[PDB]
Amino acid sequence: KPINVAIFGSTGSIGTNALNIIRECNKIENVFNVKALYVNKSVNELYEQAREFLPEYLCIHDKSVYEELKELVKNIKDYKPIILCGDEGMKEICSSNSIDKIVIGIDSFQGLYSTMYAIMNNKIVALANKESIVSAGFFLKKLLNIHKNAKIIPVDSEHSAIFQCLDNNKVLKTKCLQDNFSKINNINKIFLCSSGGPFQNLTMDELKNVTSENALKHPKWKMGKKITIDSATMMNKGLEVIETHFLFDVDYNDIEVIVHKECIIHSCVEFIDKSVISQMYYPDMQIPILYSLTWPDRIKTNLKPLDLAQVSTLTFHKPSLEHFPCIKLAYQAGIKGNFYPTVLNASNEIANNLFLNNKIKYFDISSIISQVLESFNSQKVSENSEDLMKQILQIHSWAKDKATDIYNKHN
Amino acid sequence: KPINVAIFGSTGSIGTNALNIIRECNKIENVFNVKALYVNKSVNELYEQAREFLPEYLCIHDKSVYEELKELVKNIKDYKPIILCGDEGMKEICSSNSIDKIVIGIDSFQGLYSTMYAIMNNKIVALANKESIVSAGFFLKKLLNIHKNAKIIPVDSEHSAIFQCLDNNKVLKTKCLQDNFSKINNINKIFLCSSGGPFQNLTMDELKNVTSENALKHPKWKMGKKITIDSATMMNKGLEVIETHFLFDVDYNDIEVIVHKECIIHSCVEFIDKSVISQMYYPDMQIPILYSLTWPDRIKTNLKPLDLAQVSTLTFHKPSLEHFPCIKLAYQAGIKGNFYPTVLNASNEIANNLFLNNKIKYFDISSIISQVLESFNSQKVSENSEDLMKQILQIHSWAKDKATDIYNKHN
Ligand SMILES: O=C(CC[C@@H](c1ccccc1)P(=O)(O)O)N(O)CCc1ccccc1
Ligand SMILES: O=C(CC[C@@H](c1ccccc1)P(=O)(O)O)N(O)CCc1ccccc1
Ligand SMILES: [Ca+2]
Ligand SMILES: [Ca+2]
Ligand SMILES: [Ca+2]
Ligand SMILES: [Mn+2]
Ligand SMILES: [Mn+2]
C-alpha cells in the first residue's frame, strides 16, 4: 500500500523538495516509504537526511567519501542501512524489488545511467533531468520499447503541467516517449511557457554587456548556477522544446514558446478541437514531484491555495529570437534530428560554463554552439542498445572538446 | 459508428451553434447524423433546416402551425420524415432507438420535460438549460439514480470548462449530478469565471439609476434579453454557482466567483493537491456543444486557434457583493438548500422581467428576490419522483406569484 521511493540526488533542489512534500504527506498515514537516498558527494547533508528518514539504502557516488559516510552513520542508534557507493550502488538500488518509483534529481552522466538502470528494471521513473531526454532521447525510447512496464513521468515543471492537462483516460493507453503519444491524446499544439529570464527586457546593446553576475545576483527565484545561466540565454527553454518533442511526440512546428513573466500558467495544451487546457499554480516543484509519485491519482496537500484575484494580471508575449538565439539553435538541432540534440546539449555545457566563469560574452554562447552544430556530421544510428549508448557518449565528448577548441582558438 | 443527435430548440442560439459545429465537423469527416429537430413555433426556419439536414424526425410544440410544416415539407423531394407535435412528439423523439445524444437548448417547462424524457430513455443529454438544474436539481438527481445509464453533460460554457479539466478515467467512475462527484474527481475548489457584465465598473449611485436599456444597448456580446439582464445583475453567475454545486457536488464555500473581463479562461478547477487546471479559448459556444457530443473523445475542428501572444493580457478580480447583491442571494439560497434555489430562480424570473420592462429599479431586483426567499418555509422533500416534480412546479408557481404580489404591494 505505501509507495516505495528512491531519490537520486537527494541533497539537490529536486531531492530536497521531494523529501519536503513526502514528509508532509506522511504525517498521519504511511503514504510513502523513503527506501533509498543517493548523492554524488554531499556526505554530511546525506547523513542528516538519513537520521530523519532512515532509508534501507544509502549510496554516494564519490568513493573517496564512502568511509566518511559509514563513520557518520554509526552514530545513528539501531540503524543498519545497506551503504553503497558508485555505479554498482546505483544499479543495486534500481534493481531492488523493494523499490517502485525512482526520482531522478541528478544531471549529466549519473542522471543518464540512473535513468537507464531504472528503466531496465521496469520502474516508474520520475525524471527531472531534462538533459538526459535531450541528449539520449532516441536511446531512452528504444529502452522503453524493450522494458514494457517502465514509465517516465515528467517532473520538469512545464512538462508536468502539460502531462497534467492531458486526459488520464488516454494517457493510460500510452506512455511518455512512445510513438503516437500525441495522436492518442488528441494533442494539436503545445504552449511552452517561460519566465523569460533576467535579461528579457534588455536592448541588444545592453545584452552585449551582460555578465554571469548579472544573471546570478538578486534573482527572483534562487536556483543552481547552470540552469540560471540557461534561463538567462533561454537555452533552458530550447532544451525544454526538445524535451517536449521527445516526451509527447509533438512536432517542432507545433511547439510555441511563450514568455509569461508572472510564472502562474506553467504551460498549455491545445487539442485537435482547438480547446486549450492549462495548469497553473505559484512557481513550485512540490506539485510536479508529488504528482509524478501519485499519478494517476492525486493526494491532499497543505500548499497555499492559488489566489488568482491577488495575482490579478497574467501576460504573454513571443520571445525575440534575435535577443535569444539559443532558442533558434535548439529548434534547428531538434528538426535536424540524428545526434544534433546531443551536440547542442554538450556544446551548451561548455559555453554555459565559459560564460559562468567570465571567459566569454553573451553572444559568444550561441556563436560557439552554432559552430559546433555546423561542424558535426550526421552518423548512422546504432541499432543495438549498448552501441547507441556508446555512440551518444562519444559524440557528447567530441562536442565538448570541439567547443573548447573553438574557445581556445578565438582566445 | 455515427453519432446520432437530436436538437431541441433547433432555431435558438444553442440549436444553431450546434448545427453549425456539426456541419463544419462533418466537412472534415462524417461523424454526426442529425436525426431529429424540434422547435417551439419557428416553422419557417425549421423548414429551412430540414432541407439541409434531412432528419428522420421533425417536431413542433404548437399544434396550430402543424399543418403548415407538413405543407412546407412536401416541396422537399425524396423526403418522408415523421412529423410530430407537442409534448407527445417530444416523448417520441426521446424514446427513439435511433437517437444516442440529445441537445437541450430550450427553456422553461419544455426544457425540463424534454430533459426528463431523455433521462428516462437512458440517453446522453447535453444540457444548456441551467435554470432546470437550479430549479429541479433534486428531481434530476433522483431521475439519474433511477436511470443508471443516462448522463447529463454540461453545455453552459463555464461548466463545460470545468468538465473538460477533469480526468475521464475518474469521471467514468461517477457522472454529473451524483453525490460524491467532486470526491471521486479529487476536486477541492472551483474558480467560476465571469465577464462581469455591462455594469461591472459603475458606482452604487450609478447603479441606483441604470435602466434595462443601459444593460441591453451596444453589447460587447449579443445574447437574449433575459440572460443579458442576468449578466448585468450578476444573477446569471449566482445561478451558475448553484449549477456548479448540483453538477459537480462542490460545496458553496469552495466555489469562488472571479471577474475575468477578457473571457478567455472559461473557469478553473483546483484539485486537492492545489494544482489548478483551466480551459481557455475565445468566447464560444461551439466547443462546449461539440464536447458534449464527442465526450469522452475529442474530434478535429477548423476553429481559429487561440493566439495567446495576441490576447497578451488576462485580468482577474473579486466581484463586489454590495454592487451585485444577487450573487449573495444565490449563495444564501444555495446554502439554505431545500427548495430555496427553486424560489430564487422563480422570483428572479419575475424581477428580471420587471426591470426589463422598466417597472422597477436595479436594487429592487435583489429586494424582491430577498423578500420572497424570506417568506418561504422549507418543505419536506418528497421521496417519490412524481410527487417531487409536482412540489417543484407548485413552489415555482408560488414564488412567481409572491414576487408579483411584492411588486404590486409597494407599487
Ligand atoms: O525550468 C525551470 C527553471 C527555469 C525557468 C523558470 C525560471 C523561473 C521561474 C519559472 C520558470 P525558464 O522559463 O526561465 O527557462 N523550472 O521548471 C523550474 C521552475 C520553478 C519552480 C519553482 C520555483 C522557481 C522556478
Ligand atoms: O453564461 C453565459 C453568458 C453570461 C456570462 C458571459 C457573458 C459574456 C461573455 C462570457 C460570459 P456572465 O459571466 O456575464 O454571467 N455564457 O455561458 C455564454 C458565454 C458566451 C459564449 C459565446 C459568446 C459570448 C458569450
Ligand atoms: Ca575520504
Ligand atoms: Ca489531467
Ligand atoms: Ca501538426
Ligand atoms: Mn522547466
Ligand atoms: Mn454561462
Tab-separated table of N, CA, C and O and ligand atoms in Angstrom, chain A residues 182 187-189 250-251 253-254, ligand 5:
chain	number	residue	atom	x	y	z
A	182	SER	N	0.998	11.709	-29.040
A	182	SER	CA	0.202	12.912	-29.268
A	182	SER	C	-1.103	12.559	-29.970
A	182	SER	O	-2.129	13.160	-29.678
A	187	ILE	N	-3.581	15.662	-29.058
A	187	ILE	CA	-2.803	16.894	-28.955
A	187	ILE	C	-2.616	17.521	-30.333
A	187	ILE	O	-2.197	16.837	-31.267
A	188	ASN	N	-2.868	18.828	-30.431
A	188	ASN	CA	-2.615	19.585	-31.648
A	188	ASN	C	-1.315	20.391	-31.525
A	188	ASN	O	-0.483	20.370	-32.428
A	189	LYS	N	-1.147	21.120	-30.419
A	189	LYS	CA	-0.035	22.042	-30.245
A	189	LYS	C	0.212	22.265	-28.754
A	189	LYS	O	-0.677	22.019	-27.957
A	250	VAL	N	5.373	15.486	-30.048
A	250	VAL	CA	4.844	16.680	-30.663
A	250	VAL	C	5.873	17.232	-31.647
A	250	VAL	O	7.052	17.367	-31.326
A	251	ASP	N	5.404	17.525	-32.872
A	251	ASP	CA	6.247	18.075	-33.924
A	251	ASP	C	6.763	19.458	-33.553
A	251	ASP	O	6.071	20.228	-32.903
A	253	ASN	N	7.147	22.177	-35.246
A	253	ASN	CA	6.319	23.295	-35.699
A	253	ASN	C	5.054	23.462	-34.832
A	253	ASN	O	4.402	24.490	-34.933
A	254	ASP	N	4.741	22.504	-33.940
A	254	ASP	CA	3.583	22.590	-33.056
A	254	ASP	C	3.952	22.889	-31.607
A	254	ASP	O	3.114	22.683	-30.734
C	5	CA	CA	0.557	19.052	-36.622
